[PDB]
């Protein structure tokens, strides 16, 4: 099969402290090499690879293209954020916590306790494990944040334990969609 | 550090002559324009009740791309892209409960160029019932991401496989899933 050629223009707006600080970046990629870009923080186009020299030099010569780009932070980045802040920045969906050990083994052997946090949004979250009210800071294996692609996330955090009678374990989740942390326990059967 | 990122990503690819236009927020797609139906498509229907976008702007922006690719190609002296194979992985939306509805997600990550064939297999047989997919989402490293969804009913009697085909792969890559 014949070879392929890919052109990819990417404009990205980065926001800090709401919209008190914005940074615009006009990036252009040929195949897998970014060739030229404009960084609001710099004021003008720059060629990343020699391939973009012809454009960086030209676009830099024309005033209208430079003004268009310098105003982007306001007329484009800020406008757009206000147009979607309602269903994105402010979108909040509550996690769905479930606790369960993997492997149904008799008590006093090694085990792996699973804290399955699922269906939430935003992706910022904090899962912690506690044994009889005391926080376990070791033995945790996490899967990290997983993007389901439908505007929800999921994650699993496990703890290696050697369960003994009357031990009570607790998974505590923290998330902007909940005022006070969620908790769910598991008692050493 | 930063709080949020909005990206307007697009692309054109030859010889395929296939392009794309989309907005992305913190990694998720807000919407993308359908080239063939020349209409904007929100990622969640609700979104459409809050904002709007003139599909024409995208179709126009794509033509300018077809033109600049033909220029950059020649200017590059016709060096083509080197295939980078995908990292498939099959997951489940919410935890699984027998006989209660769920959804199988097929995550195809870090690959290029944006051309891939994906087929859902149930017990060896293909499936189309309610399956859905997303357009090619971008990544920082100039590579791509994509998701395929297949709604299904958990049970102990079935097994599933996501079959991915990409030019950077030696042969079809299968990702297996089955209730345990």
């Amino acid at each position: 099969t014949r070879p392929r050629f890919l052109w990819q223009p990417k404009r990205e707006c980065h926001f800090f402290n709401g919209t008190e600080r914005v940074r615009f970046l006009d990036r252009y990629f040929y195949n897998q090499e970014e060739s030229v870009r404009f960084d609001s923080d710099v004021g003008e186009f720059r060629a990343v690879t020699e391939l973009g020299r012809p454009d960086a030099e030209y676009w830099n010569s024309q005033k209208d293209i430079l003004e268009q780009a310098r105003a982007a932070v306001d007329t484009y980045c800020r406008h757009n954020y206000g147009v979607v802040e309602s269903f994105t920045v402010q979108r909040r969906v509550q996690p769905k916590v479930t606790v369960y050990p993997s492997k149904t083994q008799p008590l006093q052997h090694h085990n792996l306790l699973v804290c399955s946090v699922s269906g939430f949004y935003p992706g910022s979250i904090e899962v912690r494990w506690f044994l009889n009210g005391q926080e376990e800071k070791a033995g945790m294996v996490s899967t990290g944040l997983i993007q389901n692609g439908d505007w929800t996330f999921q994650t699993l955090v496990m703890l290696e334990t050697v369960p003994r009678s009357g031990e009570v374990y607790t998974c505590q989740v923290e998330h902007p969609s909940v005022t006070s942390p969620l908790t769910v326990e598991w008692r050493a059967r | 550090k930063e709080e949020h990122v909005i990206i307007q990503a697009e692309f054109y690819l030859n010889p395929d002559q296939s392009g794309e236009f989309m907005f992305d927020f913190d990694g998720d797609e807000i919407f993308h324009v359908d080239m063939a139906k020349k209409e904007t498509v929100w990622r969640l229907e609700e979104f459409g009740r809050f904002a709007s976008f003139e599909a024409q702007g995208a179709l126009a922006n794509i033509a300018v791309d077809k033109a600049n690719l033909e220029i950059m190609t020649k200017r590059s002296n016709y060096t083509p892209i080197t295939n980078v194979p995908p990292e498939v992985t099959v997951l489940t939306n919410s935890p699984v409960e027998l006989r209660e509805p769920n959804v199988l997600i097929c995550f195809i990550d870090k690959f290029t160029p944006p051309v891939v064939n994906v087929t859902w297999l149930r017990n060896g047989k293909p499936v189309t019932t309610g399956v859905s997919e997303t357009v090619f989402l971008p990544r920082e490293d100039h590579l791509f991401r994509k998701f395929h969804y297949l709604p299904f009913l958990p049970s102990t009697e079935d097994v599933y496989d996501c079959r991915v085909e990409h030019w950077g792969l030696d042969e079809p890559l299968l990702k297996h899933w089955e209730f345990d």
Binding site: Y58, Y76 | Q8, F21, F50, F53, G57, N61, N68, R75
Partner: peptide
């Protein structure tokens, strides 16, 4: 409703 602004593309002398 409110409108999303797209960044207009321009060609490049060849």
């Amino acid at each position: 409703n409110p409108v999303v602004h797209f960044f207009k593309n321009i060609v490049t002398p060849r």
